[PDB]
């Protein structure tokens, strides 16, 4: 269980041809989760420069929407749960573990260029843990 550094570009600035493909600075992503090992997903529209914990936070917003939480109650729940999970590129041993604008990760910036939908798996942070020798 080696964990590799984040696969990011050298600058958060988007090249001209990629910047002009944003829809009012926003992108759409699909977030998968294992629930039986059944799968559920969210399709979320987010600012391109959201950091991975803000993506997990938006999914927390969607999950608790029916509770009619106030902004303070949502902040409390987000601070409690957003650190217990991590985002992983579907089908690849690559994680978004560090605070970078999402579009600075090479997988996301490639999805924006090619017009492809980013697919990410939200997983428990403990699955990264290696046992001690």
Ligand X SMILES: CC(C)(C)OC(=O)NCCOCCOc1ccccc1-c1nnc(Nc2ccc(CC(N)=O)cc2F)c2ccsc12
Which is nearer to ligand X, 8 or 88 (by Cβ)?
88
For residue 12, the minimal CB distance to ligand X (Å) is 25
CB 65 within 8 A of CB 76: no
31, 87, 112, 121: which one binds ligand X (CB under 6 A): 31
Total binding residues toward ligand X, as defined by CB under 6 A: 13
- Measured over the CA atoms of residue 8, residue 19, residue 29 and residue 54, the dihedral's sign is positive
Structure tokens at 36: 């039986």
In angstroms, what CA-CA distances link 28 with 47, 63, 120? Answer: 9, 17, 11
6, 42, 53, 74: which one binds ligand X (CB under 6 A): 42
85 is an interface residue for ligand X by CB under 6 A: yes
81, 97, 106, 119: which one binds ligand X (CB under 6 A): 81
């Amino acid at each position: 269980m080696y964990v590799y550094p984040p696969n990011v570009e050298s600058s958060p600035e988007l090249p001209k041809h990629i910047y002009n493909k944003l829809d009012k600075g926003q992108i759409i992503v699909v977030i998968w989760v294992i629930v039986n090992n059944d799968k559920q997903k969210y399709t979320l529209k987010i600012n391109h420069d959201c950091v991975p914990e803000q993506v997990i936070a938006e999914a927390i917003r969607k999950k608790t929407r029916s509770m009619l939480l106030s902004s303070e109650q949502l902040k409390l729940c987000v601070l409690e749960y957003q650190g217990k999970y991590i985002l992983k590129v579907c089908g690849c041993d690559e994680y978004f573990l560090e605070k970078y604008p999402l579009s600075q990760y090479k997988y996301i910036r490639s999805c924006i260029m090619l017009g492809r939908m980013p697919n990410l798996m939200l997983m428990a942070k403990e699955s990264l843990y290696s046992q001690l020798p």
